[PDB]
Amino acid sequence: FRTFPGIPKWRKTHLTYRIVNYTPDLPKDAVDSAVEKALKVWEEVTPLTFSRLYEGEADIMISFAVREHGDFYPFDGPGNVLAHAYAPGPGINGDAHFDDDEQWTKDTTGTNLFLVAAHEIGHSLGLFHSANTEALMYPLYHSLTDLTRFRLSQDDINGIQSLYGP
Ligand SMILES: CC(C)C[C@H](CC(=O)NO)C(=O)N[C@@H](CC(C)C)C(=O)N[C@@H](Cc1ccccc1)C(N)=O
Ligand SMILES: [Ca+2]
Ligand SMILES: [Zn+2]
Ligand SMILES: [Zn+2]
């Protein structure tokens, strides 16, 4: 698949992200916080260091839409998941649009801009898709591992242990 070694299309252990827009269901700042947390443990695992936009383009920049836009996995509307993204290279390199349609939350679930952010931050680089418990590749927004020490996927091992190449 994607990912590894020495990192994809940016050989620096100092990368960035940017919420292009923000869907104004949770605070803009809370949707940013949903993403920004994702980053936070992605940086614990790989040697990389993510943060909001330094300059220019980024690794993964995230917009907001869904309500029948025509992209990847869009428009299932509030509740479910919904980053309807593209990989590192594909889209606006590392692209993700969060169900703008939602009513961003954490009713244990509903939807949290947070985990699809991980599914996006991750989807871009290349640990993209697997089937394990602790993983960000795990099926949904009942994020077991929780982003504090999010010990991501089994592909996160054979992906993020590449990212940290430098
Ligand atoms: C952790 C999550 C953010 C990413 C995962 C896993 C993945 O990589 N899919 O490609 C996901 O997209 N799961 C979707 C698959 C698809 C819709 C994109 C899903 O199962 N969504 C749940 C949403 C949900 C939420 C609340 C309750 C129950 C279910 C569903 N529609 O069954
Ligand atoms: Ca949804
Ligand atoms: Zn879109
Ligand atoms: Zn996926």
Curated annotation (Swiss-Prot):
Ca(2+) 1 binds at D25, D100, E102. Zn(2+) 2 binds at H119, H123, H129. Directly cleaved by HTRA2 to produce active form. It is found in: Secreted, Extracellular space, Extracellular matrix; Nucleus; Cytoplasm. The active site is at E120. Zn(2+) 1 binds at H69, D71, H84, H97. Ca(2+) 2 binds at D59, G91, N93, D95. Metalloproteinase with a rather broad substrate specificity that can degrade fibronectin, laminin, gelatins of type I, III, IV, and V; collagens III, IV, X, and IX, and cartilage proteoglycans. Activates different molecules including growth factors, plasminogen or other matrix metalloproteinases such as MMP9. Once released into the extracellular matrix (ECM), the inactive pro-enzyme is activated by the plasmin cascade signaling pathway. Also acts intracellularly. It is linked to Coronary heart disease 6: A multifactorial disease characterized by an imbalance between myocardial functional requirements and the capacity of the coronary vessels to supply sufficient blood flow. Decreased capacity of the coronary vessels is often associated with thickening and loss of elasticity of the coronary arteries. The conserved cysteine present in the cysteine-switch motif binds the catalytic zinc ion, thus inhibiting the enzyme. The dissociation of the cysteine from the zinc ion upon the activation-peptide release activates the enzyme. Belongs to the peptidase M10A family. This is Stromelysin-1. The chain holds residues 100 to 265 of 477 of the full protein.
